[PDB]
Design a protein around this ligand. Sequence first.
Ligand code: HEM
Length: 289
Amino acid sequence: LVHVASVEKGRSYEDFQKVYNAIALKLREDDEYDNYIGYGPVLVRLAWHISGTWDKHDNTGGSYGGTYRFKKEFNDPSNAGLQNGFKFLEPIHKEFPWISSGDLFSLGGVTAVQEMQGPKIPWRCGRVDTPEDTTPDNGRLPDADKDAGYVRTFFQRLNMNDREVVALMGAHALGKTHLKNSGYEGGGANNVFTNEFYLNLLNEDWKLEKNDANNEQWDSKSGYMMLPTDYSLIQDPKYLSIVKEYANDQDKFFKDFSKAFEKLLENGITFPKDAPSPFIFKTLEEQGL
Ligand code: HEM
């Protein structure tokens, strides 16, 4: 199965920068969401979930076809809560109806990371909507109650190695878990992208507790949390080495996250040799906007 990127007709960098700006301006405007966390974290989570259905073995799933717009996928129990990100992107889709759905969902994640002071994430256009029957079945996204070997095996399906897995998981410094969405509750409620996930893993005093949905999670005295899959990154000695690296080098972490997140968003896509190069959007702050 081949999905060839096809640039939205006649569009170039400046068209997509306008879309980025509209997302970024709405991020700034709709500040109250989730007790003033704002929409950044849920848009990162949405970009990852729409990409994380990919299966390298047959090229099913993935961001290309924009299939999250179909009920089977937006109703996946693994996607509970992401409807808030979809609703946030709806007026953007209405203003720019030419951008494909996969391009919009993935650009939402890029814009959120950058506007939250994260790394620049190069982004390529050309995902093309595919029909409802191309929507992947539920059950391709990962469980949180599992250990390091589960995480490692899970991410082989996405063609990610240990460093890429540990880098991507640093997004769990953003936002929070919500009991009604996932059966987990807690988190830093942060909307600034940093390497704090790794520092918190190494430096907090963690206790394994049950939450009010009767699931186990790691809680710290200072009010942070880790899922069992997060904490597994310090139980496995190979992951632990990388956690220590990122806790000790914010620039390294930013560079490695940027590469892994672009790769995640592009898995499954064949780009023509004469496709445009990846775009690097300016933030609102770099534009004086
Ligand atoms: C083993 C892998 C992973 C598991 C099991 C996992 C699980 C979860 C769970 C259970 C939640 C809480 C959902 C809710 O209650 O609202 C969550 C939130 C989140 N996840 Fe992950 N996740 C994983 C990997 C990732 C990756 C790779 C990224 C992106 C790079 C990501 C980004 C996020 C973000 C940003 C949030 C916060 C959302 C918000 O505040 O609304 N996650 N994740």
